[PDB]
Symmetry: D2
Subunit: 153 residues, 4 copies
């Protein structure tokens, strides 16, 4: 794709990946990131448990992962929408990026070894975008669905 | 509250405040928990930051706090709804207690030193309850509102 | 499907299709209803326009259609839940069927002569079910998505 | 409110009260509309019933009223946010007014003779605003609560 569109796609992906303190506290990793769909994985660890008896992931981790998948999905959508994007142009956008509201639907108990989240834009906007997100375990079992409205400009 | 109601609440409160791995990871504390509702407090700390430049809370922490406030608010309301609960029935309820769906509305940037969450029951049920949650910093400004649907039976 | 199930689904269908005053005012029709799900449809007419200057469907209609699709989807999923329902049992359930909360995401302005809605269960339950709903124009594009939490018992 | 603000508001109130086909079909009325907010009312009539036996308002009507209250609430909050507003500058804004997403929480059966709705802005913006809505009957009993995200620029 566009030389600049590539930079941001490999930069923004790395920004979220390790430049965010909370992402590091949880061990959240943005595996990939490109024009279509981003991916976010998180390995199960004792620190992420909610109910010790059921040994299930705390609902806050599920929410966090879905929110991150959405913002990234939204911004990625903004990027691919143009070929005139300058560097500062997108930098101002990235500083504006934020969640306005989000809905999480908890489908099944959060059990698994590795969890992966992905999303897609259902409403692409120049200022506001809405996406749907999803979280599953290594067995492919859907743990939760999400829908978020993001500010992209 | 009668002995049963009081004792159950005291027990649940220490469970959430000391024996929940994810709560310990973030520093989420149950400041107050009685038949009237809950108060959850969380001190800002570097690991909870979402964007270093603006020094704001990661939307994930906010969602986590709002969700916990809702669950406990819904459980407190359940306990308060009957004069004939037994320790065993309420202990079974605490295990079934869970979030079905939740909406978080991000109002302002999450800046603060100490964050406090409280909630109220807008729809009480024997099986399903709906709660409204709020999060504010030590200055009293609202950071986010939440609405949660919880399975309570 | 099963004699009783197909019999109950048949009954419930004419109910929403004709026994509901608001459905007749809007022209809401239950195009088809089987154990697999539902498909609602509604023809455009002058009384359903929201903004005359744009000849677009009023959002209130959209939300109405999504919610009905959701309740029907939920109940259908419940019928297929057990294989030994008694016509009286399912009659008691239908009396408790109702929406707890619903989220509507508006994607495009509603245009065209006919609008069709369908949905699916994302979380099946004996007491509560969560469904996703979709509404689209005659050209196949999605006007809105919906997510609903329903009481099925 | 200065003359310009009050002028556009009176104009907007007129359009929604008489020049909106779907509002005229339901009988939705804009009782009052000023810089503070909006009051929407709708009398109960046979055509608005959802369940014949319970004589309750159809959930679609409740959702319709909450969305309209939210839109007008959002627009009023926009009108009151500035003084440099020129007549057409706000009329161009009105053309952009629309609902992005909405969540409705059904608290209890919609019984009543006259239903009234009010709302407030929980997040005011130059392009996106979030609002809370509420519907009650003539006795003051709360029927449903809403939360809407609106495009205002």
């Amino acid at each position: 794709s566009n030389p600049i569109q590539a930079e941001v796609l490999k930069r923004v992906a790395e920004v979220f990946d390790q430049h965010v303190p909370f992402h590091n506290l949880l061990g959240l990793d943005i595996k990939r990131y490109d024009i279509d769909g981003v991916e976010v994985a998180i390995n199960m660890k004792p620190e992420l448990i909610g109910n010790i008896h059921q040994q299930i992931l705390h609902g806050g981790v599920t929410a966090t992962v879905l929110d991150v998948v959405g913002g990234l999905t939204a911004f990625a959508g903004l990027v691919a929408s143009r070929d005139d994007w300058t560097i500062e142009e997108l930098q101002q956008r990235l500083q504006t990026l934020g969640t306005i509201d989000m809905r999480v639907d908890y489908l099944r108990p959060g059990r698994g070894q590795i969890f992966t989240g992905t999303g897609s834009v259902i409403r692409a906007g120049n200022r506001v975008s809405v996406c749907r997100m999803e979280l599953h375990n290594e067995q492919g079992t859907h743990i939760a669905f999400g829908t978020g409205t993001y500010m992209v400009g």
